[PDB]
RNA sequence: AGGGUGAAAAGAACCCCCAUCGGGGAGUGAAAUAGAACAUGAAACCGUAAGCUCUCAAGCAGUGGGAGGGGGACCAGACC
RNA sequence: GACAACUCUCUCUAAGGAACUCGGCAAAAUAGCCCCGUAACUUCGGGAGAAGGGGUGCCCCCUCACAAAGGGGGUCGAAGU
RNA sequence: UCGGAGAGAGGCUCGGUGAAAUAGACAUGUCUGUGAAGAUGCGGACUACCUGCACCUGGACAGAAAGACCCUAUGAAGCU
RNA sequence: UUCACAUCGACGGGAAGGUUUGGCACCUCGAUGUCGGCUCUUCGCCACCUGGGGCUGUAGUAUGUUCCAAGGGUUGGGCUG
RNA sequence: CAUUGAGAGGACCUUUCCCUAGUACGAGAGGACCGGGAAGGACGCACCUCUGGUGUACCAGUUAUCGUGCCCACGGUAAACGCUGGGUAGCCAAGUGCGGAGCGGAUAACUGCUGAAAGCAUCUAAGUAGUAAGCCCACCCCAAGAUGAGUGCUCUCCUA
RNA sequence: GAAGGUCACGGCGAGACGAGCCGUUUAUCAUUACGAUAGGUGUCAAGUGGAAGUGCAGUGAUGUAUGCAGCUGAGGCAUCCUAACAGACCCACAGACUUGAAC
């Protein structure tokens, strides 16, 4: 609508990207479900009889 | 949030609803797995669960409302004679929902939704 | 809900057939008048040998109305279509008899009006 | 209050324990009821016909819209389990049509129809 | 008094039992300690009965809800008004210096905050199983907390 | 609108990561912190690292007085 | 996906009803055919598609069809262009 | 007249691509008074943690427009 | 009636406030959009109503004038932009 | 986690009728002050179990047309659910319910007592007592981010 | 590296985004610590409504009996069969000077 004065640039428009920090991997542990050797991060498929696999043993 | 709210309207007229639920829930007996956001999978749950339990009854009467849901006249006898009668035994649970990884080039939702 | 400028088919013979409300009597200021209030409204068309000729302004009192009106005995009264009767500044109605029934909500304010009346809802 | 979550259903389990006379009496019967009709009061009740648009609900249930012919036209429903009520009689045998809903009969006042 | 919650159990071994969701302080009004068995009832053996209660619930929440909603009295068209009638009407002025008036009516947010009915008096009370009676009103919808302080008309 | 890497291009085999785009090495050259956006390549603008100041303090905010702190001093001498 | 304020395009809305407003703007409503009927005025060509009303659904029968339509009878829903 | 509710396209959040009017410089609070005399930046005083999002949107005589109003300059362009 | 000041008050005078009618035209014609209505208000006072008081050619019920006080509240329409 | 609490905001408007005395008062007519009770308007908030509204995601009737092979039974589409009707939950209202208070501290205008200077008299100049919806407080929301960063209860850690 | 917080998951008569409330398959430890927050299912209530099929009466339309049957969204009770995963990280180790009152 209206229209910017004095435009500061410096400093001010800085601080304003301090609310997009770093959002290292957003979500929980999810850390070794075991016997996966590494496994992504968030939750993935558990461990049992072949399952959402394409194919079957 | 509206107080007392159930199933999503999505971002399309109601109409729109009944007619693309109509698909994730043949191709969810006729295939078996099916891909689609959570939003979708939650939704899509109970429209295959309550269509499940119908099959479950037998008879006509839950064979004329029923095809007013899918058309595919070769999943229908399905559920009246396949899987159906696997859960006789169990009162509910039929459909098992599961998250993943994020979509290709999309944020989320993800999930897999499948008969247990 | 008989808000101004409204339309009150008359239950007498006062002379009136259909009145148009004008203002609501009251308080400060009324917005809406219920059944037991008095009305100042004038005649539209009425009857040519009768007491009251046509545009005139004369209070009445509303004995009918299409709202459904509540008491404390938790009933509900309502009508098909709203009514009033011609009432003189001392508060007895010009007319002699009255018709289209009457509302018990009037017996607390007008006694008479209830009494001649043919049937008490 | 006893613990059952049958309390705040209690105060409406004791007061339905007045059995109704008609099942659904769908219909014209035209049942009089009872009118509180205090001042001067002489211990006397009175009543007006009634007609179809039963209607009801899971508590207090409701009568239905009188919508009576006597004098200009009478309507507004009621309460029978209120303080004051007597026996309900049925009228005439019932008809056929619906049980919720119905214009009729107001603007096609006449002999027929 | 397990789940969910840890530490205000332990720290209320204090000579007491069973604790509730939120403790409530009152003030005076000669009653009675923790010295003869801590605990205390629903009968109040002295408010009195007949009198009326007053009842502080918590408010529901609009979410966002806008200012025709927190006076509702605005007029305004929306077959051909330009104020689509759901505005909140235009406030403010145009030329003048002032300091736009803080605490103007305007949309702001909803959600719970306290509310209180005070007075209505009461049909039926029981003690014991506990359970009471109010003249309607009852501020929130169920499923808060409430006060229900005795009364003060004072 | 848009100029010139170098004297001659020997203007980059092969090797490694990637989708056999891109880069880093191995080499060539006195130089590629000169290689096809390439010579010398400043400023406006956009960042990292390091020392100091920075939540109870406000007004084109620099200047004069001026503590403390991170370093550099002189075999005190009180300074940058 | 979420789905609040507000804006844009719309549905349905108790009583009353334009009382809004510069102005009933914007909406709503009227709006099918046949038949009956139709004022002032008129250079009497018109207004008269004024206004104001009724029926027309479906099936059967009269022809176990004369492409329609009409005339009787019966019947369904609150509503039958 | 007191409008409310609901269904859609935006608005809000996230993922990808990705503008502008404008702008001397900023650590650009209110108020009274003052001031080529209706400034936050003067003086006094009061108040006030630092920094965003969404929304409502009065101030910065905000933005776009060296105004088509008046007058001035023995200007100009048409007409009578 | 009488009686100057319950009320009002001729011939004249002294001030406050400042929204009227003007002057000034001091700052803006590299511009700050005129009036009214609608929406939403803020403050002050010599506030009309409610409350507390004096005088009264104030009996009462109702009024006139004056003082403190605004805490609050302070209308719907016909016609016209 | 529970509170006290420096402060701020909101609420704070008002009528009629009746009892009281239709006495006092007044030739009549007409008709109180003080105090108390009941019943409303406007407005604010909440609740919305009742009366009603929305409900194109509940169900039903049904027109034109297409399709499921067909009858039947259904489904899709039709200015902005095709039109039309009812309706549960929730959300609102013409719905329901309640507060706008009284009682105090201190005052403005005014009414006061006693008694000075002006041995009378006079509200004070010295000492006191009354006094409105203003002010303070009382009711409500926020409130030690009032960094003069409070108070009270409880819990965890004593390897080199 | 505890109390605790946070994140995620399943949801909310709480929300624009955050926050806030309940819960996380022993429905976290003892003593019953009262610990299904949602979807589905079962029952019930409510709202439509008395349909499909079949039999019968009539040329047909249509109607009748079973049918006050069936269907059934957020309402209530009940039921955790599906998903709420065993775990992590963050946050630390009784913790300053002076004086007074106590020891």
Redesign the interface.
Known sequence: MAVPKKRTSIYKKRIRKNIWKKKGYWAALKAFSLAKSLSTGNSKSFFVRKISNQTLE | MRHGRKVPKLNRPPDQRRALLRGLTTQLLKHGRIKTTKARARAVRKYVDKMITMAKDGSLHKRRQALGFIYEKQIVHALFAEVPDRYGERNGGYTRIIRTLPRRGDNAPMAYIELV | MIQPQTHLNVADNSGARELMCIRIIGASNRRYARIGDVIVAVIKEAIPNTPLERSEVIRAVVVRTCKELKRDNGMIIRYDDNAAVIIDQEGNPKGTRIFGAIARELRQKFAKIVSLAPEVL | ???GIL?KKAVHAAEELRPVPGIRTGDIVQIRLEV??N?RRLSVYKG?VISRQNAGIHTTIRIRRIIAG??????????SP?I?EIKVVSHRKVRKARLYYLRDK?PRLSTFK | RDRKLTKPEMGHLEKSGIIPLRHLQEFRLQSIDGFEVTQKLDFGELFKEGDLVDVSGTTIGKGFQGGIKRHNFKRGQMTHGSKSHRQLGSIGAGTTPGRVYKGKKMPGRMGGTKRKIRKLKIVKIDDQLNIIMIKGALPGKPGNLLRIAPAKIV
């Open positions: 209050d006893i613990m309390n509180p009709e001042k007006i006597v004098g200009v036209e009478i309507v507004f429903p009621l309460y209120n004051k107001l």
